[PDB]
Design a protein around this ligand. Structure first.
Ligand SMILES: O=c1[nH]cnc2c(CN[C@@H](CO)CCP(=O)(O)O)c[nH]c12
Ligand SMILES: O=c1[nH]cnc2c(CN[C@@H](CO)CCP(=O)(O)O)c[nH]c12
Lengths: 216, 213
């Protein structure tokens, strides 16, 4: 990749201008290498574990295509990250299945979309989330999944950790990238759904946060 | 280049990985990605000249733009990997767009959250058209509830031999054999979605994982 600024001071990555960006955080190559390295850590961690056997009604059995790792992906920010991560988990041979939940704030938390999996009791569950910032969203999701599904173990993998944003204790078990204490965009991160399709992650110019006020 | 072979057990091996649940290979990752990117170029070429209701400036009609993007509705859970790949190609070709999701199951499980689609160009992204029944259901629902200016469909896969009702998507990335496909988003009880290639499933293996997740 080539990262530079044009004559207007605008960041250009591979010939493409990003006038909404303050700084580049990570190119696609760095992001993908970071995700694949975490996929290897996740596969190495879960491959030797056993949990409730729901395929044979038996007691306990190794993680397998019969009894896969349960992954709950948090929409919408995690969908692109999850699509890439599952393919790397497959490269490393980790048996797994994915369902989705969505949460939002009104700030207080509320579930927008429930998972449809119904047999998570005694299973290993991994949450895939886009970013840990204040820690409030993941505190809410972990408490809810833990009490409603009663999994054997519950862990979190984030694409991004913004360390300085913490207001409640939260350190995901797996972290692909560390980002600056700024609003990030690209690769699933957005402003009113814009910028999600970027292959790179950037910080946002402060004046751009209210650029698209109209609800979709 | 991909290496495709069979081991002593007669099992298909792609790049050193065995697929004992597969009958035949349909498409490698390289072929799939080339086909998605080609359709992304067609979708961007078709929509970038169009105009629709202006909700950024209130009214009236304005070009597709980051202010008034193309509205994409992705069908969960089957289309999520295809969508993640397609939106990045659409970005490559400079098509302004935003994505919302609907979830269907075999009933509507999750509704769209977008509320200002009236007079907007809307594109549905779906994994496969086989019998045509799922898309006939989604199209009627989206038209009635959102009143879009235009409603089109892009599928990763068309199985033309499976039709039971009339359904011709506007954009088609790949044609598949009249067989149950697995891989690249396609699954048996959520298994096989993460494969980078599309295969046909060995007969009778659709019952391999009977327990509900
Ligand atoms: O930097 C960012 N870029 C784009 N969006 C966000 C958000 C909001 N989203 C949720 C997680 O989806 C916050 C998790 P928390 O409660 O831990 O703050 C915080 N920071 C950013
Ligand atoms: O070949 C296949 N492999 C994996 N799954 C399927 C499905 C079921 N899914 C829906 C849409 O996701 C079918 C669309 P339709 O209503 O037109 O029949 C049909 N064929 C296959």
């Amino acid at each position: 990749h080539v990262v530079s600024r044009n004559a207007e001071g605008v960041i250009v990555v591979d010939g493409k201008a990003y006038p909404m960006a303050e700084e580049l955080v990570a190119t696609e190559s760095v992001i993908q290498r970071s995700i694949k390295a975490v996929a290897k850590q996740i596969a190495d961690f879960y491959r030797p574990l056993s949990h409730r056997d729901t395929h044979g009604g038996g007691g306990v059995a190794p993680i397998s295509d019969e009894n896969p790792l349960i992954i709950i992906s948090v929409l919408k920010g995690s969908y692109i990250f999850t699509a890439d991560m599952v393919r790397y988990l497959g490269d490393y041979g980790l048996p797994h299945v994915v369902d989705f939940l969505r949460v939002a704030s009104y700030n207080k938390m509320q579930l927008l979309a429930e998972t449809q999996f119904k047999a998570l009791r005694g299973k290993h569950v991994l949450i895939l989330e886009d970013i840990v910032d204040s820690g409030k969203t993941l505190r809410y999701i972990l408490d809810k999944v833990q009490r409603e599904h009663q999994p054997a173990t519950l862990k979190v993998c984030v694409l991004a950790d913004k360390p300085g944003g913490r207001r409640v204790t939260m350190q995901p078990d797996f972290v692909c990238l560390t980002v600056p204490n700024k609003y990030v965009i690209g690769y699933g991160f957005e402003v009113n759904d814009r910028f999600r399709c970027f292959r790179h992650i950037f910080t946002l110019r402060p004046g751009e946060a209210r650029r698209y006020p109209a609800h979709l």
